[PDB]
Design a protein around this nucleic acid. Structure first.
Ligand SMILES: [Zn+2]
Ligand SMILES: [Zn+2]
Ligand SMILES: [Zn+2]
Ligand SMILES: [Zn+2]
Lengths: 55, 111, 105, 81, 109, 971, 75
RNA sequence: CAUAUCCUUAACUCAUUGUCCCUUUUUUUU
């Protein structure tokens, strides 16, 4: 039912931003569209880390 | 210029007893205007008439003689239209004219 | 208040009634609870000054002794536009204090 | 679990009060319909955006406002379910 | 001249295990006739009892004098039982036929 | 008989009368069914859950069975026989009956030496572990904790219920640490436990005959904490909660009454209208009037929560019902209670409500007629001054009843008409007032308590209208009014006291102050204290509203002599004689000047008698009459008083000393510091050891005096004195009363204006090493106070240097005082934002979460100050540090971060804040997503209009169009 | 208050007590074993994951514990 | 997982009087 990373990367206008987990999104097309829009800042990287922030 | 904060439409009662301000959708407010014994203008607290999911195209105050002030409206309800995937409900929903009456006895606005 | 998460504002459409503050609450802001820089006067909704309640404290509910204001920062953020700022429930802290003193005394 | 459900009740409370707040499960369609309708209201409100649109299309302003009010019903097509 | 919490049913703690039915009825039957006795089987309840007296005043007296009695080298702890809940439906059909038979019997209504 | 009876806390069962005891008869019902459960599925047969129709059959069947026993009584309880199969309903399933034996038929000792036994050592009465003391009367609730058992042996249900039993024991009897932890854990694990297992152990505890009200309070706190948790899983338990909470609506304790209301309104919002309506339907026609009373109270609450249009059809159906008048009575009582509770809210429904009640005024049952009149009076009070047109329908039966009925109907009908009179316009009001005045003249005689309570109110209501004449009132109302109502038994009840003083003030408006005050002035010398107190209140309010231009010279001697007598002869230790004295002499003004020798001599004399209360009251009287001596231009006498009160400083009773200080405070205000005798040079070093006094009244009145001298009079003391008095103020920060603490903080700024900010600031910075948070938070505020009053370049360097001290509280402290500082200086803080930007970015990188929450508070307040001033590069830089903290979960830190972002939205704009959120609004994880969505909503609420220009461009997909084509227009 | 001392400042006395407890307990901890952080907290330098503890009383109580002893003998 | 403890946070508070009058075949007498 869901895209793999290769189809998603070709379907973006810009394929450098797509990550492993973006296919797990409920609307992956819009997510990779928003990640490739200008001047938006990315989600803080430690959202997936098990250790707490700055600890 | 918010979507639900009033200010867009403004209608006065032709005798001069109330004024009604409404937003494009779901928010209306009536103010009752009066004169004190020193001939100064006095204002009341707002009476509200709110109706969710409802668009207003125009609002005008109706000239009823000295009865309770009426306000007429070109309303439309988009609630059904956002729940029809086929798109029929957008096509055959229709605009209504609704009259709001300010009941000066009971201090409240009734549709 | 900002110190009590379980308290709840009225938030109805405010009217021409001026909200007041009891001696304990004098000089503080109704929203963010600050002591400095008063910017605008507080208006309360009709139901909240009904009857005997006319003129009680907005924040706690005691006999009001001066007018309540919003501070400058709540004005700039337009927190003064959300509704009637009367607190409508006592909350856990007030109730607990009563039963504790009554147990002792 | 219960925190999920309390977040859910709080956000549907907000959404009833201010039309057009989202929550964690806003679909694309819902977000864009909100910002279309807010745009239309904003265009009606500001006088010079409405002048600009009434000049760029050769229409009168009353016709422009009436067409924008007609578009408020289904601004982005039918709901995607 | 009684407090409202007095009850026909008594709850008994510190009861020595596998005491006989006869010894039980002989201990508690002095104060009055006994409507029913229930003894705890399940091991969490094992060793405690409920005694129902036919008379409320006997139960009052058995609480008043029974407490701290020494049976099998241990003190006996007696209390009133607070019958605060119901465990089954009241079976409206049986109560209906019973009331119909009473009303039929005395021509009431 | 116990000698400890003085010491133990009382029980709820003791203050209850015969009427209240009915709530201990009610037992917990068996299992009830939920119709809405699983989408309203077809009910499973043989479930043995009671439905609605089972409940109504049982109710009808017991009504019939009592009718039977009432019939069979005339021909010829716990005492009643108990059937064998129904008895089984009284016990849990654990036990098996014994068969009676056959031998049972129903109906000194000397010296002995003992054998050693170990068995008495073995038996225990308390549970094992860290569990609280188990009181002996709780044994049958917590008996399963006594026996010891391995957890693995028993079932998951039994370990779940044993777990709940331990938690409830810790909530009832624990110390506040145990109680806090257990409370939290039963809240968090509530849904996992399920609504069933909680309630069948919580509800038996609230039914116990030996609760104290603090234990009842803790238990209902448990119920409303778990009511947020299982919001939809409480439907089978709605009625069970009500019969354990509805008694609290008629509890004599006000806070019990309020918390009963809040938990019924939360229960209504959790269960919804249909569940509530079905559940309470049976209790409307119940045979007991206790159940009907409290159900009528509770429907009012459910109507407050869900709204009147919801249950207005049901309520109309219950008031029309012509099988039972109990149900009609109960429905009209619900309407009365709604009007008492809702107040102003009922107006939009007034004509719906009156039409439900109109048929009750003409009912054949007299109780129903009475409750309809009381309901009309409630509605008309709530609607003042609207709805006269809605009440036109009932003016005719009401009137007909007032002319016709005599007796007990008349009180209720007369009450209703008295409330309808202010609603109506002048032409009809003048009609109805005259005839109802004639009825009230007749009813002044009546020795019936409800009639007296009614006609005082109705006198006031007919006295408001203009259709009564002043001549008529003082000729015909006034002599029987003062003969029948101004009595000693009227003054003892508080409602009668209060109504009486209100009505007499309203009469004085029409008639005149002299005519009322001259009838009651000689009872300022009455020798019943409560009477004098009532008379004092009436005079006080009359001379407060009307002034004293009407009072001639012969009556003012009466009045001055009477208030002096009443002041000297008080015992009850309240402010009524003091307020009365102040109001009267301020009203008299300059006319009181010949009486000031008498007053000063009296007060001066009572300042040294043996009773502490008498001396206290004398100093209070000086503090009230200080202003009168300024208007009477008698500053020499007040100057003398200041000299006298200075010698009373050495008092050892703190109540008297606080009043001496209060009196001094008033004299300093009235005369001024520079003409004060004893001079401020003599007074301030007298006051500095009075600071040590730990009593709150002394501290409060002394700090105000000290702080006021600190600014208006700082040259009366040496700089070393202000320094050591400054040191002393650090002990004033441990006070419990908050006003003492904020007066103390202010005084630090005034002192720093005299000895300079550095000496003050070093002391305050040293105080941050203290452990207790109340000291440190106040020191922090005082650092900001001085920083603001002596401009921030003076105290900045030292405060920023203190951030390097290797102690955690000091570093949190400096950050906290910067937070207050930027809040205080406002726009002037654009001068120091570049100075403190690197300090804050050091704090926002810190490992301690608190360091990050206080730095976010600093960012919020600094952000709003520099709004409009072009400091956006610093703020955007600090956003880069604030923003990764959005995934914190602790609530204090989480709300400080959100406050910082809401401050930044108004300083660097909605566009930047949307640019931060954009990438995570549709992120795959719900964790990142809902945090991101609740930032977006804050931007949306605050700036919904500005975002129109800032949204990104979303492309069209296959069937929906998403481009905003108008903005793409080119001119 | 100069000639004979009056009263006592219990807050500052409690600060002194915290210092004296610190000096006492610190003299039994060798300098490698404990690392003092910027804010005055202490980390255990033996244990590989460097737990950080708020007081020296807690550091001593930690060094008693079994997790520390196991981590100690490897080092 | 299930238990104490230590540290810390929120200018956190220092009791309250605010028709509960509801109830008995019950009703102040020419
Ligand atoms: Zn207050
Ligand atoms: Zn504020
Ligand atoms: Zn309000
Ligand atoms: Zn270690």
């Amino acid at each position: 039912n869901r895209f793999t990373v290769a189809e998603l990367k070709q379907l973006v206008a810009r394929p450098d931003v797509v990550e492993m987990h973006d296919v797990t999104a409920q609307d992956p097309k819009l997510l990779v569209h928003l990640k490739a829009t200008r001047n938006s800042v990315p989600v803080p990287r430690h959202w997936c880390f098990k250790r707490k922030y700055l600890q | 210029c918010r979507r639900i904060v009033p200010g867009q439409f403004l209608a006065v009662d032709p005798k001069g007893r109330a004024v009604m301000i409404s937003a494009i959708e779901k928010q209306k407010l009536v103010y009752i205007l009066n004169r004190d014994a020193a001939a100064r203008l006095t204002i009341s607290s707002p009476l509200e008439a709110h109706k969710a999911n409802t668009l207003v195209y125009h609002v005008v105050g109706v000239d009823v003689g000295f009865e309770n002030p009426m306000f007429a409206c070109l309303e439309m309800d988009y609630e059904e239209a956002d729940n029809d995937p086929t798109g029929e409900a957008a096509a055959n929903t229709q605009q209504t004219l609704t009259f709001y009456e300010l009941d000066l006895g009971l201090n409240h606005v009734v549709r | 208040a900002k110190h009590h998460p379980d308290l709840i504002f009225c938030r109805k459409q405010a009217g021409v009634a001026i909200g007041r503050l009891c001696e304990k609450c004098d000089g503080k802001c109704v929203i963010c609870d600050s002591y400095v820089r008063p910017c605008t006067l507080v208006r309360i909704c009709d139901e909240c000054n009904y009857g005997s309640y006319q003129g009680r404290c907005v924040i706690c509910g005691g006999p009001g002794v001066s007018d309540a204001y919003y501070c400058k920062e709540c004005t700039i953020q337009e927190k003064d536009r959300d509704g009637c700022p009367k607190i409508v429930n006592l909350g856990s802290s007030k109730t607990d204090l009563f039963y504790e003193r009554k147990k002792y005394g | 679990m219960t925190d999920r459900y309390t977040i859910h009740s709080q956000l549907e409370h907000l959404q009833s009060k201010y039309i057009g707040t989202g929550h964690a499960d806003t679909t694309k369609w819902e977000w864009l319909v909100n910002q279309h309708r807010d745009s239309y209201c904003s265009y009606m409100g500001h006088f010079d955006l409405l002048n600009y649109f009434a000049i760029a299309e050769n229409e009168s302003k009353a016709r422009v406002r009436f067409n924008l009010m007609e578009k408020m019903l289904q601004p982005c097509g039918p709901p995607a379910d | 001249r009684l407090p409202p919490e007095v009850n026909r049913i008594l709850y008994i703690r510190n009861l020595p295990y596998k005491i006989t039915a006869e010894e039980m009825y002989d201990i508690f039957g002095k104060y009055g006739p006994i409507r029913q006795i229930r003894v705890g089987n399940t091991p969490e309840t094992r060793g405690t009892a409920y005694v129902v007296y036919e008379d409320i005043f006997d139960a009052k007296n058995a609480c008043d004098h029974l407490s701290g009695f020494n049976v099998c080298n241990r003190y006996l702890v007696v209390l009133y039982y607070n019958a605060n809940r119901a465990f089954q439906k009241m079976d409206t059909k049986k109560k209906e036929e019973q009331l119909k038979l009473l009303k039929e019997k005395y021509g009431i209504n | 008989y116990d000698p400890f009876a003085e010491h133990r806390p009382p029980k709820i069962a003791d203050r209850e009368d015969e009427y209240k005891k009915h709530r201990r008869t009610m037992i917990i019902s068996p299992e009830r069914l939920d119709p809405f459960a699983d989408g309203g599925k077809t009910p499973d047969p043989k479930m043995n859950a009671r439905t609605y129709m089972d409940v109504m059959r049982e109710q009808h069947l017991t009504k019939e069975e009592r009718e039977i026993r009432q019939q069979l009584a005339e021909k010829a309880e716990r005492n009643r026989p108990l059937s064998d199969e129904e008895l089984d309903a009284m016990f849990p399933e654990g036990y098996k009956v014994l068969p009676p034996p056959a031998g049972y038929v129903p109906i000194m000792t000397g010296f002995h030496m003992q054998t050693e036994d170990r068995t008495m050592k073995s038996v225990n009465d308390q549970p094992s572990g860290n569990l609280p003391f188990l009181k002996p009367d709780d044994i049958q609730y917590f008996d399963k904790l006594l026996v010891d058992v391995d957890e693995s042996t028993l079932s998951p249900e039994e370990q779940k219920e044993r777990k709940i039993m331990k938690l409830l024991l810790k909530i009832k009897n624990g110390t506040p640490p145990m109680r806090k932890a257990a409370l939290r854990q039963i809240t968090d694990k509530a849904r996992e436990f399920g609504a069933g297992p909680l309630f069948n152990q919580i509800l038996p505890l609230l039914m116990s005959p030996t609760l104290e009200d603090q234990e009842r309070h803790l238990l209902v706190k448990v119920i409303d904490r778990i009511l947020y948790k299982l919001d939809d899983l409480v439907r089978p338990y709605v009625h069970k909660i009500l019969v354990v909470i509805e008694p609290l609506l008629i509890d004599e304790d006000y806070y019990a009454r309020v918390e009963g209301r809040e938990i019924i309104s939360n229960l209504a919002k959790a269960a919804g209208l249909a569940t509530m309506i079905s559940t309470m339907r049976p209790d409307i026609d119940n045979m007991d009037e206790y159940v009907r009373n409290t159900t009528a109270r509770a429907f009012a609450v459910v109507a407050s929560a869900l709204g009147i249009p919801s249950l207005l059809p049901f309520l109309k159906a219950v008031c029309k019902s012509k099988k039972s008048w109990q149900a009609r009575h109960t429905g009209i009582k619900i309407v009365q209670q709604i009007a008492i509770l809702m107040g102003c809210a009922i107006l939009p429904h007034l004509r719906s409500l009156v039409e439900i009640i109109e048929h009750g005024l003409v009912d054949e049952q007299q109780k129903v007629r009475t409750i309809s009149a009381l309901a009309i009076a409630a509605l008309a009070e709530a609607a003042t001054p609207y709805g006269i047109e809605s009440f036109d329908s009932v003016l005719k039966p009401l009137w007909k009843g007032i002319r016709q009925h005599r007796g007990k109907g008349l009180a209720a009908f007369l009450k209703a008409i008295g409330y309808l009179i202010p609603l109506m316009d002048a032409e009809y009001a003048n009609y109805y007032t005259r005839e109802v005045m004639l009825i009230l003249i007749r009813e002044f005689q009546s020795p019936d308590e409800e009639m007296k309570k009614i006609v005082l109110k109705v006198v006031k209501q007919c006295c408001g209208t203009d259709g009564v004449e002043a001549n008529y009132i003082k000729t015909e109302i006034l002599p029987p009014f003062f003969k029948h109502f101004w009595q000693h038994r009227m003054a003892l009840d508080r409602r009668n006291y209060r109504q009486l003083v209100d009505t007499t003030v309203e009469l004085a408006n029409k008639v005149g102050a002299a005519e009322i005050i001259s009838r009651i002035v000689d009872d300022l010398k009455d020798e019943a204290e409560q009477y004098r107190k009532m008379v004092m209140e009436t005079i006080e309010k009359i001379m407060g509203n009307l002034g004293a231009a009407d009072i001639d010279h012969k009556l003012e001697e009466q009045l001055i002599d009477g208030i002096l007598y009443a002041f000297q002869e008080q015992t009850t230790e309240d402010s009524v004689m003091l307020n009365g004295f102040g109001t009267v002499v301020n009203a008299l003004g300059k006319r009181v000047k010949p009486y000031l020798p008498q007053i000063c001599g009296t007060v001066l004399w009572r300042l040294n008698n043996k009773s502490a209360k008498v001396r206290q009251q004398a100093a209070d009287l000086i503090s009230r009459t200080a202003v009168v001596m300024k208007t009477c231009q008698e500053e020499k006498l007040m100057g003398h008083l200041g000299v006298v009160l200075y010698e009373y400083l050495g008092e050892e009773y703190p109540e008297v000393l606080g009043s001496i200080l209060g009196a001094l405070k008033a004299i300093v205000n009235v005369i001024g510091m520079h003409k004060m005798t004893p001079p401020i040079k003599d007074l301030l070093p007298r006051l500095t050891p009075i600071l040590k006094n730990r009593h709150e009244k002394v501290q409060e009145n002394c700090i105000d005096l000290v702080g006021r001298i600190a600014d208006r009079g700082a040259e009366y003391v040496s700089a070393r004195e202000w320094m050591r008095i400054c040191f002393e103020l650090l002990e004033l920060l441990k006070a419990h009363k908050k006003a003492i603490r904020r007066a103390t903080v202010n005084t630090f700024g005034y002192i720093a204006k005299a000895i300079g900010p550095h000496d003050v600031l070093a002391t305050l910075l040293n105080n941050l090493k203290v452990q207790e948070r109340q000291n440190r938070v106040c020191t922090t505020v005082a650092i900001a106070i001085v920083a603001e009053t002596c401009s921030p370049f003076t105290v900045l360097p030292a405060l920023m240097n203190e951030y390097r001290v290797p102690e955690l509280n000091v570093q949190n402290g400096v950050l906290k005082s910067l937070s207050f500082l930027f809040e205080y200086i406002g726009e002037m803080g654009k001068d120091y934002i570049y100075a403190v930007t690197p300090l804050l970015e050091d704090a926002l990188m810190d490992r301690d979460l608190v360091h990050r929450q206080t730095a976010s508070a600093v960012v919020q307040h600094m952000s709003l100050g520099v709004y409009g001033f072009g400091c956006e590069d610093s703020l955007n830089h600090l956003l880069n540090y604030v923003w990764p903290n959005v995934f914190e979960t602790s609530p204090h830190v989480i709300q400080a971060v959100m406050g910082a972002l809401e401050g930044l939205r108004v300083a660097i704009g909605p566009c930047r804040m949307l640019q931060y959120c954009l990438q995570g609004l549709f992120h795959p994880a719900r964790k990142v997503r809902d945090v991101y969505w609740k930032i977006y909503n804050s931007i949306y609420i605050g700036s919904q209009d500005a975002l129109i220009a800032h949204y990104p461009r979303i492309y069209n997909d296959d069937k929906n169009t998403y481009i905003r084509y108008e903005l793409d227009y080119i001119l | 208050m100069s000639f004979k001392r009056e009263g006592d400042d219990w807050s500052q006395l409690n600060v002194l007590k915290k210092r004296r407890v610190g000096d006492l307990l610190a003299s039994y901890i060798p300098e490698d074993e404990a690392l003092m952080l910027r804010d005055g907290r202490f980390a255990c330098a033996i244990c590989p994951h460097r737990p950080v503890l708020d007081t020296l009383a807690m550091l001593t109580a930690h060094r008693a514990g079994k997790k520390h002893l196991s981590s100690l003998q490897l080092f």
